[PDB]
Structures are given as C-alpha cells and as structure tokens.
C-alpha cells in the first residue's frame, strides 16, 4: 500500500552479487507483509573524502555499479553522495533522497524512504562509516531499516543490546530469507590481489571493467 | 605438470552459481599445488531414471547447464550420462569420461578427478559404505577434489571411513570458502513461491525457467 524506496549506502568497492541479492530479498519481504509497494532501489556509493587507502576512486565504483545493474529493471545507481565536495553522513543522504522522492511523487499514501543494510549494521552502525550518536535516532525513526541477515548474524540480540533500536524497533524490518550470496567486497579484493578467480561472485561486466582498468592489483 | 579434468555429477536441478563457483575454486586449488594443469571441466547431469518427483526432464537440465556455461572458456556440459537408457553409478561415468580423455591423446597420463562439495563427501562415508568397492575405485583410481561448504568437516569424513582414510592422498581439500552457499532445493522452493532467485543463478537460466514454465506449482 505504502510506496517505498530502498536506499543502500556503502563503499561498493566493488559491488558484488551479495549487494544485489540484498535488494531482491528486501523487496520480496516488504511485498510479503502486504503493506508496501517497492517502487525503486538506489545504490549510493560512498564519497572519497577521508576514504580508506583501499577505496578506489568514486567514478570507478559508480561505473561498476552501473555495469552491475544493467540487468535490473528497478535498481539504479545515484552518484549524488559521491559527487559532494565534503564528507557525507548517511542521514544527510537519506534526507536528500527523501526530499527528491517527495518531489517526484507529487508529479505522478505518501512514499517512504528506508535504508537497506545487512543485519550486522544493527551491531556496527557503519554504512560504511560510524554514524554519529545524535543521528541514529533520526535514521531508525524517520526513515527506518530493512535488514537482511547473513549467516551468523543475530538481529534480535543486536536490537536487545541497544536501547535506541529497541525504542523504535517498529521501524526495523527483519527480512526472513537468507542472503546465500555470502560475498564481502573484502574477500573479492583479496582474491583479485592474489590472482584468484572471482567469477560468479560478481557480474561478468564488473570483472571485465576491473581487469581493463587494472583495479585491485597490488 | 600433469593435465587434469574435473567432473561434476549431480542433478543440476537447476544449475546455480554454487556449482560454477565450485569448478573455479577447485581449479585454483589444483593449480596452486604446483603439480597439476587443469585443462577442462565437465558437468554431467543425472539420468531421469534416477527420478525423484521434482526432477525436471534431463533435456531441460542440460539445456540450462549449456546456457549457464556460455561465459565459461573451460567448462562444458556432457549429456552422455543423461542419454543412457538407465541411471548409472558415478564410477561408471568416471570410467567413460576417463576413456574419452585417454582417447583424445595426451600432451605422464592425464587424470580425471571427481569434483564435489563436502555434503557429497559426507555421503561417501556413512557406515554402509566402509567396504564399498565403488567408493574405493573412485578415490583410488580417480580421486576427489572437495570444496568446503560452511558447516561441514571434510577431514573428519575422511578419517571416519577406512577407504577414504587409506586413499586420503588422492582427496584434495580446497581451502577457499565457496561463498555461493546456494542449493538447488532452495532455488526450487523460491521459484514455487514466486520469490526472486536473481543473482543466485545465471540470468539466461532464469530466463529459460520463466519461458519454459519450470518449477512452478
């Protein structure tokens, strides 16, 4: 009933089959509750400001995400966060896309914008950078979390061990289906650096881009 | 070094990104040992005589495997096993393909090894098989490349069978995690429920399944 947009923040360094699968599982879960209609997915790669030494330039990560999504009919990459001239907090990215969602919807209930993350975020509060204490309440309260759990994640204990999460747990949606694609970008970077295969862990066009551009080779 | 062919037998009902990942991990492992040169991979779907209720017709399973292998330059699907009049034990499939390997001459003696996950390795060591002569022929004459599936202990499987223990030196344990922990059983259940299996299978396989109306209740 409620139209919803799923925003995924993170380094996407590189994007993998895990990140794409997260969108699919989350959309199925929200549709399965009966109360939501998922309209769009947004992949928002992190800004280069103060980035880790292993973080490749943002125009590469945007290009790889675009190649990864050419078989998707509902997820798009938005480079706005990465184009900003400063360090960006996730809550400000959500505010920006929420505003542009309210604008676009007026031209065509009112839509909602939710942050898509793994269950580990409920313990870590990093997407990919540690959120400020004063921003956690706004993210879980005004937007909400759609959490997909990898093996070994325990979202209900994470929510128990956090008073702010418990306070507003009604805006945290725990998807039930497993991720199965247990593929961190860290593993892919290590494998690439050691010359090991990453075929079938990320789309072939991303692998081709990585080789052509010489990324992730030490 | 010695040329090696990897053979995977199974239902492939449907093939998933897990099966293809297994081949890549196995080839990297063998190459890393320094003693082997992997020249080919063979996917061999099971005969329909086998025949559980949810086993789709072998024509479709080898069609889907062929579509999945379009982007591979070294793994092929061989429908020989599925075209025989009767189901065959794995060891007879190994015998057949080993003969084919020898006949395509030799660049030593090429070797043919069976590729499996640790869950199949588990099926080789239950106590009814501790004296089985086919299991022994598999590990003595061909050998095994085992890719570890999270939550399995291949070393204890090896130690619990006297046959596997005796021929442990022809059982190769790949170290890299599979990561694509995707069962065909999950995929069928999700397809029957209308759930997404995108990014769990090659896109052309999902398209074939949709176009053919497979796995729908």
JSON list of C-alpha atoms in Angstrom, two decimals, chain B residues 20-217:
[
{"chain": "B", "resi": 20, "resn": "UNK", "atom": "CA", "xyz": [30.04, -22.97, -11.27]},
{"chain": "B", "resi": 21, "resn": "UNK", "atom": "CA", "xyz": [31.91, -21.44, -8.33]},
{"chain": "B", "resi": 22, "resn": "UNK", "atom": "CA", "xyz": [32.90, -24.97, -7.22]},
{"chain": "B", "resi": 23, "resn": "UNK", "atom": "CA", "xyz": [34.77, -25.50, -10.50]},
{"chain": "B", "resi": 24, "resn": "UNK", "atom": "CA", "xyz": [36.61, -22.19, -10.24]},
{"chain": "B", "resi": 25, "resn": "UNK", "atom": "CA", "xyz": [37.72, -22.84, -6.66]},
{"chain": "B", "resi": 26, "resn": "UNK", "atom": "CA", "xyz": [38.81, -26.41, -7.47]},
{"chain": "B", "resi": 27, "resn": "UNK", "atom": "CA", "xyz": [40.89, -25.30, -10.46]},
{"chain": "B", "resi": 28, "resn": "UNK", "atom": "CA", "xyz": [42.62, -22.58, -8.43]},
{"chain": "B", "resi": 29, "resn": "UNK", "atom": "CA", "xyz": [43.42, -25.15, -5.71]},
{"chain": "B", "resi": 30, "resn": "UNK", "atom": "CA", "xyz": [44.93, -27.70, -8.09]},
{"chain": "B", "resi": 31, "resn": "UNK", "atom": "CA", "xyz": [46.95, -25.05, -9.92]},
{"chain": "B", "resi": 32, "resn": "UNK", "atom": "CA", "xyz": [48.23, -23.75, -6.56]},
{"chain": "B", "resi": 33, "resn": "UNK", "atom": "CA", "xyz": [49.58, -27.20, -5.58]},
{"chain": "B", "resi": 34, "resn": "UNK", "atom": "CA", "xyz": [52.08, -26.84, -8.45]},
{"chain": "B", "resi": 35, "resn": "UNK", "atom": "CA", "xyz": [51.63, -30.41, -9.72]},
{"chain": "B", "resi": 36, "resn": "UNK", "atom": "CA", "xyz": [48.52, -30.09, -11.93]},
{"chain": "B", "resi": 37, "resn": "UNK", "atom": "CA", "xyz": [47.35, -28.34, -15.10]},
{"chain": "B", "resi": 38, "resn": "UNK", "atom": "CA", "xyz": [43.55, -28.23, -15.24]},
{"chain": "B", "resi": 39, "resn": "UNK", "atom": "CA", "xyz": [42.53, -28.42, -18.89]},
{"chain": "B", "resi": 40, "resn": "UNK", "atom": "CA", "xyz": [38.77, -28.99, -18.73]},
{"chain": "B", "resi": 41, "resn": "UNK", "atom": "CA", "xyz": [35.68, -29.19, -16.56]},
{"chain": "B", "resi": 42, "resn": "UNK", "atom": "CA", "xyz": [32.73, -31.48, -17.28]},
{"chain": "B", "resi": 43, "resn": "UNK", "atom": "CA", "xyz": [29.19, -31.08, -15.96]},
{"chain": "B", "resi": 44, "resn": "UNK", "atom": "CA", "xyz": [27.23, -34.35, -16.27]},
{"chain": "B", "resi": 45, "resn": "UNK", "atom": "CA", "xyz": [23.57, -34.14, -15.23]},
{"chain": "B", "resi": 46, "resn": "UNK", "atom": "CA", "xyz": [21.98, -37.30, -13.85]},
{"chain": "B", "resi": 47, "resn": "UNK", "atom": "CA", "xyz": [19.73, -39.58, -15.89]},
{"chain": "B", "resi": 48, "resn": "UNK", "atom": "CA", "xyz": [15.97, -39.27, -15.41]},
{"chain": "B", "resi": 49, "resn": "UNK", "atom": "CA", "xyz": [15.78, -42.98, -14.40]},
{"chain": "B", "resi": 50, "resn": "UNK", "atom": "CA", "xyz": [17.03, -41.73, -11.01]},
{"chain": "B", "resi": 51, "resn": "UNK", "atom": "CA", "xyz": [13.70, -39.96, -10.97]},
{"chain": "B", "resi": 52, "resn": "UNK", "atom": "CA", "xyz": [12.51, -38.12, -7.91]},
{"chain": "B", "resi": 53, "resn": "UNK", "atom": "CA", "xyz": [9.20, -36.33, -8.41]},
{"chain": "B", "resi": 54, "resn": "UNK", "atom": "CA", "xyz": [10.71, -32.84, -8.67]},
{"chain": "B", "resi": 55, "resn": "UNK", "atom": "CA", "xyz": [13.49, -33.90, -11.09]},
{"chain": "B", "resi": 56, "resn": "UNK", "atom": "CA", "xyz": [12.86, -31.88, -14.26]},
{"chain": "B", "resi": 57, "resn": "UNK", "atom": "CA", "xyz": [13.46, -33.65, -17.58]},
{"chain": "B", "resi": 58, "resn": "UNK", "atom": "CA", "xyz": [17.14, -34.08, -18.43]},
{"chain": "B", "resi": 59, "resn": "UNK", "atom": "CA", "xyz": [16.68, -32.22, -21.71]},
{"chain": "B", "resi": 60, "resn": "UNK", "atom": "CA", "xyz": [15.89, -29.09, -19.68]},
{"chain": "B", "resi": 61, "resn": "UNK", "atom": "CA", "xyz": [18.68, -29.65, -17.13]},
{"chain": "B", "resi": 62, "resn": "UNK", "atom": "CA", "xyz": [21.37, -29.96, -19.80]},
{"chain": "B", "resi": 63, "resn": "UNK", "atom": "CA", "xyz": [19.84, -27.04, -21.73]},
{"chain": "B", "resi": 64, "resn": "UNK", "atom": "CA", "xyz": [20.09, -24.88, -18.59]},
{"chain": "B", "resi": 65, "resn": "UNK", "atom": "CA", "xyz": [23.64, -26.04, -17.91]},
{"chain": "B", "resi": 66, "resn": "UNK", "atom": "CA", "xyz": [24.62, -25.22, -21.51]},
{"chain": "B", "resi": 67, "resn": "UNK", "atom": "CA", "xyz": [23.11, -21.72, -21.16]},
{"chain": "B", "resi": 68, "resn": "UNK", "atom": "CA", "xyz": [24.92, -21.28, -17.83]},
{"chain": "B", "resi": 69, "resn": "UNK", "atom": "CA", "xyz": [28.24, -22.23, -19.44]},
{"chain": "B", "resi": 70, "resn": "UNK", "atom": "CA", "xyz": [28.12, -19.68, -22.28]},
{"chain": "B", "resi": 71, "resn": "UNK", "atom": "CA", "xyz": [30.59, -17.44, -20.45]},
{"chain": "B", "resi": 72, "resn": "UNK", "atom": "CA", "xyz": [33.00, -20.26, -19.50]},
{"chain": "B", "resi": 73, "resn": "UNK", "atom": "CA", "xyz": [36.02, -20.92, -21.67]},
{"chain": "B", "resi": 74, "resn": "UNK", "atom": "CA", "xyz": [36.88, -24.25, -19.97]},
{"chain": "B", "resi": 75, "resn": "UNK", "atom": "CA", "xyz": [33.75, -26.00, -18.53]},
{"chain": "B", "resi": 76, "resn": "UNK", "atom": "CA", "xyz": [31.38, -27.91, -20.82]},
{"chain": "B", "resi": 77, "resn": "UNK", "atom": "CA", "xyz": [28.19, -29.89, -20.30]},
{"chain": "B", "resi": 78, "resn": "UNK", "atom": "CA", "xyz": [28.31, -33.52, -21.44]},
{"chain": "B", "resi": 79, "resn": "UNK", "atom": "CA", "xyz": [24.85, -35.13, -21.80]},
{"chain": "B", "resi": 80, "resn": "UNK", "atom": "CA", "xyz": [26.22, -38.69, -22.33]},
{"chain": "B", "resi": 81, "resn": "UNK", "atom": "CA", "xyz": [25.15, -39.86, -18.85]},
{"chain": "B", "resi": 82, "resn": "UNK", "atom": "CA", "xyz": [21.64, -38.44, -19.20]},
{"chain": "B", "resi": 83, "resn": "UNK", "atom": "CA", "xyz": [21.24, -40.06, -22.65]},
{"chain": "B", "resi": 84, "resn": "UNK", "atom": "CA", "xyz": [21.85, -43.63, -21.45]},
{"chain": "B", "resi": 85, "resn": "UNK", "atom": "CA", "xyz": [18.85, -45.93, -21.12]},
{"chain": "B", "resi": 86, "resn": "UNK", "atom": "CA", "xyz": [19.42, -46.35, -17.38]},
{"chain": "B", "resi": 87, "resn": "UNK", "atom": "CA", "xyz": [20.78, -44.50, -14.38]},
{"chain": "B", "resi": 88, "resn": "UNK", "atom": "CA", "xyz": [24.49, -45.17, -13.83]},
{"chain": "B", "resi": 89, "resn": "UNK", "atom": "CA", "xyz": [26.64, -45.18, -10.72]},
{"chain": "B", "resi": 90, "resn": "UNK", "atom": "CA", "xyz": [29.11, -42.30, -10.59]},
{"chain": "B", "resi": 91, "resn": "UNK", "atom": "CA", "xyz": [32.09, -44.61, -11.04]},
{"chain": "B", "resi": 92, "resn": "UNK", "atom": "CA", "xyz": [30.83, -45.77, -14.44]},
{"chain": "B", "resi": 93, "resn": "UNK", "atom": "CA", "xyz": [30.57, -42.13, -15.54]},
{"chain": "B", "resi": 94, "resn": "UNK", "atom": "CA", "xyz": [34.17, -41.59, -14.41]},
{"chain": "B", "resi": 95, "resn": "UNK", "atom": "CA", "xyz": [35.25, -44.71, -16.36]},
{"chain": "B", "resi": 96, "resn": "UNK", "atom": "CA", "xyz": [33.52, -43.43, -19.51]},
{"chain": "B", "resi": 97, "resn": "UNK", "atom": "CA", "xyz": [34.98, -39.94, -19.40]},
{"chain": "B", "resi": 98, "resn": "UNK", "atom": "CA", "xyz": [38.44, -41.24, -18.47]},
{"chain": "B", "resi": 99, "resn": "UNK", "atom": "CA", "xyz": [38.38, -43.40, -21.59]},
{"chain": "B", "resi": 100, "resn": "UNK", "atom": "CA", "xyz": [37.34, -40.36, -23.64]},
{"chain": "B", "resi": 101, "resn": "UNK", "atom": "CA", "xyz": [40.20, -38.39, -22.05]},
{"chain": "B", "resi": 102, "resn": "UNK", "atom": "CA", "xyz": [42.79, -41.05, -22.91]},
{"chain": "B", "resi": 103, "resn": "UNK", "atom": "CA", "xyz": [41.46, -41.31, -26.48]},
{"chain": "B", "resi": 104, "resn": "UNK", "atom": "CA", "xyz": [41.81, -37.57, -27.15]},
{"chain": "B", "resi": 105, "resn": "UNK", "atom": "CA", "xyz": [45.55, -38.46, -26.87]},
{"chain": "B", "resi": 106, "resn": "UNK", "atom": "CA", "xyz": [47.91, -36.88, -24.36]},
{"chain": "B", "resi": 107, "resn": "UNK", "atom": "CA", "xyz": [50.22, -33.85, -24.43]},
{"chain": "B", "resi": 108, "resn": "UNK", "atom": "CA", "xyz": [52.58, -38.63, -17.88]},
{"chain": "B", "resi": 109, "resn": "UNK", "atom": "CA", "xyz": [48.88, -39.81, -18.34]},
{"chain": "B", "resi": 110, "resn": "UNK", "atom": "CA", "xyz": [46.06, -37.25, -17.88]},
{"chain": "B", "resi": 111, "resn": "UNK", "atom": "CA", "xyz": [43.99, -37.63, -14.72]},
{"chain": "B", "resi": 112, "resn": "UNK", "atom": "CA", "xyz": [40.24, -37.34, -14.17]},
{"chain": "B", "resi": 113, "resn": "UNK", "atom": "CA", "xyz": [39.04, -36.27, -10.73]},
{"chain": "B", "resi": 114, "resn": "UNK", "atom": "CA", "xyz": [35.55, -36.04, -9.24]},
{"chain": "B", "resi": 115, "resn": "UNK", "atom": "CA", "xyz": [34.53, -32.57, -8.08]},
{"chain": "B", "resi": 116, "resn": "UNK", "atom": "CA", "xyz": [32.20, -32.40, -5.09]},
{"chain": "B", "resi": 117, "resn": "UNK", "atom": "CA", "xyz": [31.14, -30.31, -2.16]},
{"chain": "B", "resi": 118, "resn": "UNK", "atom": "CA", "xyz": [31.63, -31.54, 1.38]},
{"chain": "B", "resi": 119, "resn": "UNK", "atom": "CA", "xyz": [27.98, -32.66, 1.57]},
{"chain": "B", "resi": 120, "resn": "UNK", "atom": "CA", "xyz": [28.60, -35.31, -1.11]},
{"chain": "B", "resi": 121, "resn": "UNK", "atom": "CA", "xyz": [31.83, -36.32, 0.62]},
{"chain": "B", "resi": 122, "resn": "UNK", "atom": "CA", "xyz": [29.63, -36.92, 3.66]},
{"chain": "B", "resi": 123, "resn": "UNK", "atom": "CA", "xyz": [27.58, -39.35, 1.56]},
{"chain": "B", "resi": 124, "resn": "UNK", "atom": "CA", "xyz": [30.74, -41.35, 0.79]},
{"chain": "B", "resi": 125, "resn": "UNK", "atom": "CA", "xyz": [31.49, -42.21, 4.45]},
{"chain": "B", "resi": 126, "resn": "UNK", "atom": "CA", "xyz": [28.28, -43.49, 6.03]},
{"chain": "B", "resi": 127, "resn": "UNK", "atom": "CA", "xyz": [28.85, -46.88, 7.66]},
{"chain": "B", "resi": 128, "resn": "UNK", "atom": "CA", "xyz": [27.12, -48.86, 4.88]},
{"chain": "B", "resi": 129, "resn": "UNK", "atom": "CA", "xyz": [29.93, -47.79, 2.52]},
{"chain": "B", "resi": 130, "resn": "UNK", "atom": "CA", "xyz": [33.03, -48.57, 4.61]},
{"chain": "B", "resi": 131, "resn": "UNK", "atom": "CA", "xyz": [33.83, -51.61, 2.43]},
{"chain": "B", "resi": 132, "resn": "UNK", "atom": "CA", "xyz": [32.15, -50.47, -0.79]},
{"chain": "B", "resi": 133, "resn": "UNK", "atom": "CA", "xyz": [34.26, -51.29, -3.86]},
{"chain": "B", "resi": 134, "resn": "UNK", "atom": "CA", "xyz": [32.83, -48.44, -5.98]},
{"chain": "B", "resi": 135, "resn": "UNK", "atom": "CA", "xyz": [33.76, -45.80, -3.38]},
{"chain": "B", "resi": 136, "resn": "UNK", "atom": "CA", "xyz": [37.23, -47.32, -3.30]},
{"chain": "B", "resi": 137, "resn": "UNK", "atom": "CA", "xyz": [37.54, -47.20, -7.08]},
{"chain": "B", "resi": 138, "resn": "UNK", "atom": "CA", "xyz": [36.51, -43.53, -7.03]},
{"chain": "B", "resi": 139, "resn": "UNK", "atom": "CA", "xyz": [39.16, -42.48, -4.54]},
{"chain": "B", "resi": 140, "resn": "UNK", "atom": "CA", "xyz": [41.89, -44.94, -5.61]},
{"chain": "B", "resi": 141, "resn": "UNK", "atom": "CA", "xyz": [41.70, -44.74, -9.42]},
{"chain": "B", "resi": 142, "resn": "UNK", "atom": "CA", "xyz": [40.32, -41.22, -9.94]},
{"chain": "B", "resi": 143, "resn": "UNK", "atom": "CA", "xyz": [40.48, -39.08, -6.81]},
{"chain": "B", "resi": 144, "resn": "UNK", "atom": "CA", "xyz": [38.36, -36.29, -5.38]},
{"chain": "B", "resi": 145, "resn": "UNK", "atom": "CA", "xyz": [38.52, -32.52, -5.28]},
{"chain": "B", "resi": 146, "resn": "UNK", "atom": "CA", "xyz": [36.39, -31.32, -2.37]},
{"chain": "B", "resi": 147, "resn": "UNK", "atom": "CA", "xyz": [35.25, -27.71, -1.94]},
{"chain": "B", "resi": 148, "resn": "UNK", "atom": "CA", "xyz": [34.22, -26.96, 1.61]},
{"chain": "B", "resi": 149, "resn": "UNK", "atom": "CA", "xyz": [30.63, -25.98, 2.32]},
{"chain": "B", "resi": 150, "resn": "UNK", "atom": "CA", "xyz": [30.20, -23.94, 5.51]},
{"chain": "B", "resi": 151, "resn": "UNK", "atom": "CA", "xyz": [29.26, -26.21, 8.40]},
{"chain": "B", "resi": 152, "resn": "UNK", "atom": "CA", "xyz": [30.93, -29.40, 7.12]},
{"chain": "B", "resi": 153, "resn": "UNK", "atom": "CA", "xyz": [34.11, -31.08, 8.37]},
{"chain": "B", "resi": 154, "resn": "UNK", "atom": "CA", "xyz": [35.76, -32.89, 5.45]},
{"chain": "B", "resi": 155, "resn": "UNK", "atom": "CA", "xyz": [38.79, -34.05, 7.47]},
{"chain": "B", "resi": 156, "resn": "UNK", "atom": "CA", "xyz": [36.55, -35.98, 9.88]},
{"chain": "B", "resi": 157, "resn": "UNK", "atom": "CA", "xyz": [34.59, -37.52, 6.98]},
{"chain": "B", "resi": 158, "resn": "UNK", "atom": "CA", "xyz": [37.93, -38.69, 5.57]},
{"chain": "B", "resi": 159, "resn": "UNK", "atom": "CA", "xyz": [39.01, -40.11, 8.92]},
{"chain": "B", "resi": 160, "resn": "UNK", "atom": "CA", "xyz": [35.69, -41.89, 9.61]},
{"chain": "B", "resi": 161, "resn": "UNK", "atom": "CA", "xyz": [35.82, -44.14, 6.52]},
{"chain": "B", "resi": 162, "resn": "UNK", "atom": "CA", "xyz": [38.63, -46.74, 6.27]},
{"chain": "B", "resi": 163, "resn": "UNK", "atom": "CA", "xyz": [38.50, -46.41, 2.48]},
{"chain": "B", "resi": 164, "resn": "UNK", "atom": "CA", "xyz": [38.76, -42.62, 2.49]},
{"chain": "B", "resi": 165, "resn": "UNK", "atom": "CA", "xyz": [41.47, -42.83, 5.16]},
{"chain": "B", "resi": 166, "resn": "UNK", "atom": "CA", "xyz": [43.55, -45.29, 3.11]},
{"chain": "B", "resi": 167, "resn": "UNK", "atom": "CA", "xyz": [43.39, -43.14, -0.03]},
{"chain": "B", "resi": 168, "resn": "UNK", "atom": "CA", "xyz": [43.45, -39.70, 1.64]},
{"chain": "B", "resi": 169, "resn": "UNK", "atom": "CA", "xyz": [46.38, -38.72, -0.60]},
{"chain": "B", "resi": 170, "resn": "UNK", "atom": "CA", "xyz": [44.06, -38.64, -3.63]},
{"chain": "B", "resi": 171, "resn": "UNK", "atom": "CA", "xyz": [41.47, -36.48, -1.81]},
{"chain": "B", "resi": 172, "resn": "UNK", "atom": "CA", "xyz": [42.22, -32.78, -2.41]},
{"chain": "B", "resi": 173, "resn": "UNK", "atom": "CA", "xyz": [40.67, -30.30, 0.03]},
{"chain": "B", "resi": 174, "resn": "UNK", "atom": "CA", "xyz": [40.27, -26.81, -1.42]},
{"chain": "B", "resi": 175, "resn": "UNK", "atom": "CA", "xyz": [40.87, -24.12, 1.18]},
{"chain": "B", "resi": 176, "resn": "UNK", "atom": "CA", "xyz": [38.86, -21.20, -0.27]},
{"chain": "B", "resi": 177, "resn": "UNK", "atom": "CA", "xyz": [35.27, -20.85, 1.00]},
{"chain": "B", "resi": 178, "resn": "UNK", "atom": "CA", "xyz": [32.58, -21.38, -1.59]},
{"chain": "B", "resi": 179, "resn": "UNK", "atom": "CA", "xyz": [30.64, -18.20, -0.55]},
{"chain": "B", "resi": 180, "resn": "UNK", "atom": "CA", "xyz": [27.86, -19.09, -3.05]},
{"chain": "B", "resi": 181, "resn": "UNK", "atom": "CA", "xyz": [26.03, -21.21, -0.47]},
{"chain": "B", "resi": 182, "resn": "UNK", "atom": "CA", "xyz": [23.10, -21.86, -2.82]},
{"chain": "B", "resi": 183, "resn": "UNK", "atom": "CA", "xyz": [21.24, -25.16, -3.00]},
{"chain": "B", "resi": 184, "resn": "UNK", "atom": "CA", "xyz": [19.04, -26.15, -5.92]},
{"chain": "B", "resi": 185, "resn": "UNK", "atom": "CA", "xyz": [16.43, -27.10, -3.30]},
{"chain": "B", "resi": 186, "resn": "UNK", "atom": "CA", "xyz": [16.27, -23.50, -2.09]},
{"chain": "B", "resi": 187, "resn": "UNK", "atom": "CA", "xyz": [16.00, -22.25, -5.67]},
{"chain": "B", "resi": 188, "resn": "UNK", "atom": "CA", "xyz": [13.09, -24.57, -6.47]},
{"chain": "B", "resi": 189, "resn": "UNK", "atom": "CA", "xyz": [11.28, -23.61, -3.28]},
{"chain": "B", "resi": 190, "resn": "UNK", "atom": "CA", "xyz": [11.72, -19.89, -4.02]},
{"chain": "B", "resi": 191, "resn": "UNK", "atom": "CA", "xyz": [10.54, -20.28, -7.62]},
{"chain": "B", "resi": 192, "resn": "UNK", "atom": "CA", "xyz": [7.44, -22.16, -6.46]},
{"chain": "B", "resi": 193, "resn": "UNK", "atom": "CA", "xyz": [6.63, -19.29, -4.09]},
{"chain": "B", "resi": 194, "resn": "UNK", "atom": "CA", "xyz": [7.19, -16.55, -6.66]},
{"chain": "B", "resi": 195, "resn": "UNK", "atom": "CA", "xyz": [10.28, -15.26, -4.85]},
{"chain": "B", "resi": 196, "resn": "UNK", "atom": "CA", "xyz": [13.34, -13.83, -6.58]},
{"chain": "B", "resi": 197, "resn": "UNK", "atom": "CA", "xyz": [16.32, -16.02, -7.40]},
{"chain": "B", "resi": 198, "resn": "UNK", "atom": "CA", "xyz": [18.09, -13.24, -9.28]},
{"chain": "B", "resi": 199, "resn": "UNK", "atom": "CA", "xyz": [21.87, -13.14, -8.63]},
{"chain": "B", "resi": 200, "resn": "UNK", "atom": "CA", "xyz": [21.68, -16.78, -7.42]},
{"chain": "B", "resi": 201, "resn": "UNK", "atom": "CA", "xyz": [21.67, -18.25, -10.97]},
{"chain": "B", "resi": 202, "resn": "UNK", "atom": "CA", "xyz": [22.88, -17.12, -14.39]},
{"chain": "B", "resi": 203, "resn": "UNK", "atom": "CA", "xyz": [20.37, -14.76, -15.97]},
{"chain": "B", "resi": 204, "resn": "UNK", "atom": "CA", "xyz": [19.92, -16.94, -19.05]},
{"chain": "B", "resi": 205, "resn": "UNK", "atom": "CA", "xyz": [18.95, -19.83, -16.74]},
{"chain": "B", "resi": 206, "resn": "UNK", "atom": "CA", "xyz": [16.27, -17.72, -15.03]},
{"chain": "B", "resi": 207, "resn": "UNK", "atom": "CA", "xyz": [15.03, -16.68, -18.47]},
{"chain": "B", "resi": 208, "resn": "UNK", "atom": "CA", "xyz": [14.88, -20.30, -19.63]},
{"chain": "B", "resi": 209, "resn": "UNK", "atom": "CA", "xyz": [12.98, -21.29, -16.46]},
{"chain": "B", "resi": 210, "resn": "UNK", "atom": "CA", "xyz": [10.49, -18.44, -16.93]},
{"chain": "B", "resi": 211, "resn": "UNK", "atom": "CA", "xyz": [9.99, -19.19, -20.66]},
{"chain": "B", "resi": 212, "resn": "UNK", "atom": "CA", "xyz": [9.54, -22.95, -20.09]},
{"chain": "B", "resi": 213, "resn": "UNK", "atom": "CA", "xyz": [7.31, -22.62, -17.03]},
{"chain": "B", "resi": 214, "resn": "UNK", "atom": "CA", "xyz": [9.61, -24.80, -14.92]},
{"chain": "B", "resi": 215, "resn": "UNK", "atom": "CA", "xyz": [9.45, -25.20, -11.12]},
{"chain": "B", "resi": 216, "resn": "UNK", "atom": "CA", "xyz": [6.00, -23.57, -10.90]},
{"chain": "B", "resi": 217, "resn": "UNK", "atom": "CA", "xyz": [3.34, -25.08, -8.65]}
]
